[PDB]
Amino acid sequence: HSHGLFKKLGIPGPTPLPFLGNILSYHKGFCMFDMECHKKYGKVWGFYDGQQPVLAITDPDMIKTVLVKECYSVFTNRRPFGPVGFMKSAISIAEDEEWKRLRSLLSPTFTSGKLKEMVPIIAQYGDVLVRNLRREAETGKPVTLKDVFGAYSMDVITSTSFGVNIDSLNNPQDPFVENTKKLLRFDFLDPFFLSITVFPFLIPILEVLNICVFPREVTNFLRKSVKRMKESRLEDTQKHRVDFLQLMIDSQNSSHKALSDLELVAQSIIFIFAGYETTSSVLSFIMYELATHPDVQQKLQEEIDAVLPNKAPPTYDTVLQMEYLDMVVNETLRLFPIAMRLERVCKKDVEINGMFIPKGVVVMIPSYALHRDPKYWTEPEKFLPERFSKKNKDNIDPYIYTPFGSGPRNCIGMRFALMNMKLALIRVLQNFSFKPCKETQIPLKLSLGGLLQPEKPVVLKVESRDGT
Template sequence: MSSRPSAPTVGRPTGTREIPTIRRKDGLGGALAFRNDQLRFLGAGLDRYGDIFRFRPLGIPIVMVNHPDYIRHILVEKGESYDKDAVLFRVVRPVLRQGLIANPDMELWRRQRRMMAPHFTPRTVGNFARNMTDETALMLQRWERRPGEVLDVTDEIGQLALRIVNRSLFSAEVGATAQAFERAFGTANAILGAFFRFPFPPLNVPTPRSRKLHRAIDEMDTFVSTFIRARLAEDTPASEDADLLTLLLHSVDEEDGKGMDLEQLHHEVLNICIGAYETTTNTLSWAFYLLARHPEVEAKLHAEVDAALGGRSVPSFEDLASLPYTRMVIDETLRIYSPAYQFMRRAREEDTVGGYRVPAHTNILVNSYFLHRHPDFWEEPERFVPERFTPEAIAARPKHVYTPFGAGHRICIGKHFALTELILVLATVARRYRLTLPDAATEVVPEALITLHPKGGIHLRLEERR
């Protein structure tokens, strides 16, 4: 059990209390401590104050919440009272703009969600499963010439993720342009992650950093607009087997009968590219790293994949039901190293959370790196144990103690696409190869950017299964 202060009941009828605040005299550090090591600073705050506390990097008030009752209240029970006009999303908005991920306009967000949601259901995602396995099989063919090599797994999976998303979005094969997109996003991720931790000077000040960021944004915009212009010139009709871009071009809002304008379409396509690329790249990189460190888990994964596929080398969408342990490996990886490890909301009005008064316009931070390690709900949380995600174990936990895709009405629209891709890619690779620790392996640590990235990347040795 936790030694942290206990969490009061949400919405209790007694008088409200003020949220504990980290102060300079507490010895936890201030803005510089948050800037230098965000995870250590937040962990120290949780250890000192429990599951809710306030801190002020450069005078910006932020409240961190780390209890499933609080998260259910904010994201589900009163989800309409909390929006995305919060500091973290203001930081990333220069890249994501009015796309679904960071859109603060709730009416515009609802309209976009209505139009896009039908294209991201489990049934429609099945139409793109072949893209996922085909591209993975092509990657494995290239790996045939590299047995025994130490691969930069993060780079390999990053290129694969971009090929999958581009084939699903644009029906296109990409090479050097995808690598340019990957580099541009990496640059933006690092700059914006540093700016969130220490938001000075403002990004609209023409510093070398801001100019570098805008060059990266321009590269990503060019990547997306090239495909959109080409598709508009083709005037491709929508059909059941159409790619996502065609489906979005022909989407119409059921309430006003209109589609997206080209600027909004550009924003949504860019959001999909970034979301699909980053989730797959980081999750699978961490998954292969964790499997390399836990051969007993890898053996169970191989046994399941072999049994499910029989004599086949590549799984299909229909095989997902036969790969429950593979899904557990993915879920446990997402618990330990969620790429979208933090998100924020802004209180639109005064509220009470856990008996604490939350003033209007408060920035609320949820950090799943800590939520997914909460000692009251996860036994030995640093251990890699896929069995935490058996149906019985899931039912025994509060639902909102596990939030790799968020929760409530703004849960990630790409959840089904991401999970399908992660399971199918992992199973395809596991059918033929093992990725093992190099002889001089060192522990990989997470780097807290806007997303949670393996610092220095994951490097593993490629071995054919015998």
């Protein structure tokens, strides 16, 4: 019972129940819980995930202090979440100095140059997705976005970490894809995780039995797959394709360095885990918005048609040049910041601009809630891209709008993700128009689970701009 911590500090929040803390209030999902707390408690509030104290903060300066100012010193790590095994070394699960070192070895791998050089590969799959989407529409039936983008997301992943070039969508059974496919984002509200939240003392027991949240079935497979291609393939030299693995392999081969072949395997897997369902979900939200806002869709199409007359293949610089595109992407991320919350564990007693935060408390920034906070957004529930226009985006506080988090521990694949999604969006809109379908849910309703996603999958009628 650390359940008295918050009233002891005079910090408001919902009253916790023995053992459960406040988890039954998650019956409508993390985001609804955070919006309702924001509303009734104010700028700061506390709650308990089992016995774990969580202090939500909403003040921009405090957020910067936590995410930026005091990253290395006090708020360096995310909260532990369950049995992880060797993945304990994935950069996103790694802690303190261990994390700092991994954050160095990997920086170069995510530089624009390395990125630009990966465009041809990803772009190549944009052609594949279009080629693919061409059929699904050409046919007649509504298209289920998660699937088309799931495959596209998959294809970019494999391809950008050694030439495993597969048309994932039409090779549903290619084992290598049938495994990477299983690397889905965790729903921390499913029974298992709720149980570990209420019985955290069970994690060491699962670790000793080698029980891991990532499917060993799949982790084993890729561990071995990387092993061979890391040898078998390029252990022949002469001709390499600037993918993450190679960047990880070569980074290996000539301060703190030397990525353990196991670490490297951990990185490759986490990069997949970090980008697979995230990219696909964001693309789907965007397409939903464009379909329910024809005018925006058209305008986007006109800009694309302008920067690339007559379906001209997208390019790094060409992508960067499109502003309405950038505005549409950003607006969608404001409405659907898929991480939902940003978190940091307080490694030690501290005071940040006024309030004292005890050691061990989890400091949480409710992105979903700050993104829809009336106090900062006119008609928060509305999809209005102008919000991010050139002469308007300056009024946006970066500690309020945080779809990719902020500070030293922000999303390391952010630019890659933005690039990936735009290239895809360009290719697709540069060929089709998505319109609401009779089965299209409007307004879109969000799941009540622990992931930010539509209640029912988004399906839309897809039409080719002059397809005969």
